[PDB]
Amino acid sequence: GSSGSSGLPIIVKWGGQEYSVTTLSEDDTVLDLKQFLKTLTGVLPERQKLLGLKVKGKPAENDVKLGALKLKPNTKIMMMGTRESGPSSG
Secondary structure: OOOOOOOOOEEEEEOOEEEEEOOOOOOOEHHHHHHHHHHHOOOOOOOOEEEOOEEOOEEOOOOOEHHHHOOOOOEEEEEEOOOOOOOOOO
């Protein structure tokens, strides 16, 4: 290509869409990601469900370091949840 590595790229899969994240790094916390995932997709973080990286049952927390998890790069993970308040969208 042209460039190699630098930070920690992340990939998310929402329904039928893929989101890329290359702003935050290991330093940043899951929250940062979530917070950024709240604007990327448009769903609350507490609601946003991260499917891919689990932790002895439940997935990492927002008060947990993404680095500690030592996940893989360009790790295409999945997401679950809904946008807008209420069960019915429209």
